[PDB]
């Protein structure tokens, strides 16, 4: 059985579904964990030294990766799950900043799963037929999930499709399924929201009639609650943008994470 380490919980689940009985997957960032503020520990280094495959997001999400690979002595296979995926970027200070959250489009999740399948087959060719069978089944589930998600938003009004959340993690979801996401913090929870941005969000919501706000499982909800209180926005619940729920929760897998987020956002539209 291949020993696989994922950088964070979402990728660990995709690797588990693709690999099935032929992989054992551990994750560095766990359920409800913030991937932006994470730094790895000696326990993480020890775990990676035993691994056959490491699965990461790329797109700048794991700044610590190279130093952890060096310290651990990891000599296995590195799989960048975002390879080939079309990225989005923000235009800031005359430069571009890549948005790493590409998996919140289920069509991109299917591309992630194909990259992970490719890496597992490369690392375990003895099981290539079995891995390809379970992988292609999962990929088909994800492209059909993408079609289901589009359908939940396509037959409802295009006007006023705006929600408020804690940070800018749903950009690819919003582009794929056509919903505008507002948030006081940007692409990363390493950066505090400026007074300028908080004031502008409150003004925008008051002026443009945003009705629903969400918290996120990996990020302190105090700030989004402050904006909601200043605007009278009503709660829509808890979204799971970049970490699975704990076991027994509403977002125990990537599929269930996507379904949960789609259901909650669509229901708030409505
Ligand atoms: Zn994020």
Author numbering: 23 to 292
Q: Anything the authors wrote about it?
A:
Here, we report the identification of ZnuCBA and ZniCBA, two ATP-binding cassette permeases that are highly conserved in Klebsiella species and contribute to K. pneumoniae AJ218 zinc homeostasis, and the high-resolution structure of the zinc-recruiting solute-binding protein ZniA. In the Enterobacteriaceae, the prototypical example of this pathway is ZnuCBA from E. coli (Patzer and Hantke, 1998; Ammendola et al., 2007). This system is comprised of a cluster A-I solute-binding protein (SBP) that recruits Zn(II) from the periplasm, ZnuA, and an ABC transporter, ZnuBC, that actively translocates SBP-delivered metal ions into the cytosol. The ZniCBA permease is highly conserved in Klebsiella species and closely related Enterobacteriaceae, but is absent from other species such as E. coli and S. enterica. The ZnuCBA and ZniCBA permeases appear functionally redundant for Zn(II) uptake, with either system sufficient for wild-type growth and Zn(II) acquisition.
Recombinant, mature (residues 22-292) K. pneumoniae AJ218 ZniA was purified and crystallization was attempted using Mn(II) and Zn(II). Crystals of the SBP in the Zn(II)-bound state were obtained and the structure determined at 1.59 Å resolution. A single ZniA molecule was present in the asymmetric unit with a fold characteristic of proteins belonging to the cluster A-I subgroup of ABC transporter-associated SBPs (Scheepers et al., 2016). ZniA was comprised by two globular domains (henceforth the N- and C-terminal domains), with each domain consisting of a central four-stranded parallel β-sheet surrounded by four α-helices. The N- and C-terminal domains were linked by an interdomain α-helix and the protein bisected by a cleft in which the metal binds. The metal-binding site was located ~13 Å from the molecular surface of the protein and comprised by three Nϵ2 atoms, from His58 (β2α2 loop), His123 (β6α4 loop), and His189 (β7α6 loop), and one Oϵ2 atom, from Glu264 (β10α9 loop). These four residues bind a single Zn(II) ion via 4-coordinate geometry, with bond distances of 2.0 Å to 2.1 Å. In the Zn(II)-bound state of ZniA, the metal-binding site was occluded from bulk solvent. The structure of Zn(II)-bound ZniA was next compared with the closest phylogenetic match, AztC from P. denitrificans, which has structural similarities to both Zn(II) and Mn(II) binding SBPs. Structural superposition analyses revealed that the SBPs had similar global conformations, with a root mean square deviations of the Cα protein backbones (Cα-RMSD) of 1.3 Å.
